[PDB]
Design an enzyme around this catalytic site. Structure first.
Site, PDB file in Angstrom:
ATOM      1  N   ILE A  83       0.837  -1.192   0.000  1.00 56.31           N
ATOM      2  CA  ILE A  83       0.000   0.000   0.000  1.00 56.31           C
ATOM      3  C   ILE A  83       0.873   1.244   0.000  1.00 56.31           C
ATOM      4  O   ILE A  83       1.723   1.411   0.877  1.00 56.31           O
ATOM      5  CB  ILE A  83      -0.852   0.080   1.278  1.00 56.31           C
ATOM      6  N   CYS A  84       0.642   2.126  -0.963  1.00 52.11           N
ATOM      7  CA  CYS A  84       1.340   3.403  -0.998  1.00 52.11           C
ATOM      8  C   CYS A  84       0.498   4.414  -0.246  1.00 52.11           C
ATOM      9  O   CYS A  84      -0.500   4.907  -0.768  1.00 52.11           O
ATOM     10  CB  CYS A  84       1.552   3.875  -2.434  1.00 52.11           C
TER      11      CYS A  84
END
Ligand code: OXL
Ligand code: ZN
Ligand code: ZN
Lengths: 146, 110
Positions: A83-84
């Site tokens: 997840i960014c």
């Protein structure tokens, strides 16, 4: 880290962010499974999404490692579930909690940040053809998360 | 007197016999907790080159040695005891997870 982790676990069991849950995997307090219900303001509506959380030795001064286990179609989440999200790296603070992280991820699901993508193809579709983006995100939701 | 809120680093409140401090940005931390935070942040900033309040990001003034000297708070670990309701919900989750596995919906990372 353990005392802090127990505190959070209890604070989450009794007042979880809306439509989320999180707790230990078996006996291991440093490894949690969480769930997020796809937000109604998102193409993930109706799905249930599992995540893995691993706490570092120096938690809460270093961020937890959080990843999706349930496959999801999103510009900021890749095929490894990474997840960014800024608060999971540069903007982490010990003032944050897993509860706040889950809320932030829910917000990310409703409103992606296509200008900082982990998946350029999805980011391109998001920015040029939202109709297509939302359709495909719903399609993956229905097949994998429902 | 003693602050009514909670140290956001350890998640415990403040007790009359504990050593805690207040920042110029009006935020309270146990001295021990804030010392660990600062030590960590100092190492981090060095490895890439202004320690900020964990709550509001105002730059902190401090003397690390003075915070370190303070007694660590004595705080009983909070037992984890899942309610009957959470155990029920956990069972429904297992069922959903099993379906996702069957669908190829679960990332492995072989
Ligand atoms: O990724 C898939 O397999 C899909 O979209 O049908
Ligand atoms: Zn504290
Ligand atoms: Zn502050």
């Amino acid at each position: 880290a353990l005392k802090r982790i127990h505190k959070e676990l209890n604070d989450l069991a009794r007042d979880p962010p809306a439509q989320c849950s999180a707790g230990p995997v078996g006996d291991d307090m440093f490894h949690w499974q969480a769930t997020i219900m796809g937000p109604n303001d998102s193409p993930y509506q109706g799905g249930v999404f599992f995540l893995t959380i691993h706490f570092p030795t120096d938690y809460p001064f270093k961020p937890p490692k959080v990843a999706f286990t349930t496959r999801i179609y999103h510009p900021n989440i890749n095929s490894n579930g990474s997840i960014c999200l800024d608060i999971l790296r540069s903007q982490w603070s010990p003032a944050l909690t897993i509860s706040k992280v889950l809320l932030s991820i829910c917000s990310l699901l409703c409103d992606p940040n296509p200008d900082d993508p982990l998946v350029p193809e999805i980011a391109r579709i998001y920015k040029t053809d939202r109709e297509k983006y939302n359709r495909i995100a719903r399609e993956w939701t229905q097949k994998y998360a429902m | 007197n003693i602050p009514h809120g909670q140290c956001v680093i350890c998640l415990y409140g403040f007790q009359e016999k504990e050593a805690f401090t207040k920042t110029p940005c009006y935020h309270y931390f146990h001295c021990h907790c804030l010392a660990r935070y600062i030590q960590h942040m100092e190492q981090e900033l060095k490895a890439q080159g202004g320690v900020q309040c964990p709550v509001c990001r105002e730059p902190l003034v401090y003397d690390l040695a003075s915070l370190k000297a303070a007694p660590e708070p004595q705080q009983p670990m909070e037992l984890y005891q899942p309610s009957a309701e959470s155990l029920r919900q956990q069972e429904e989750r297992k069922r959903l997870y099993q379906r996702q596995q069957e669908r190829g919906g679960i990332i492995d990372l072989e």
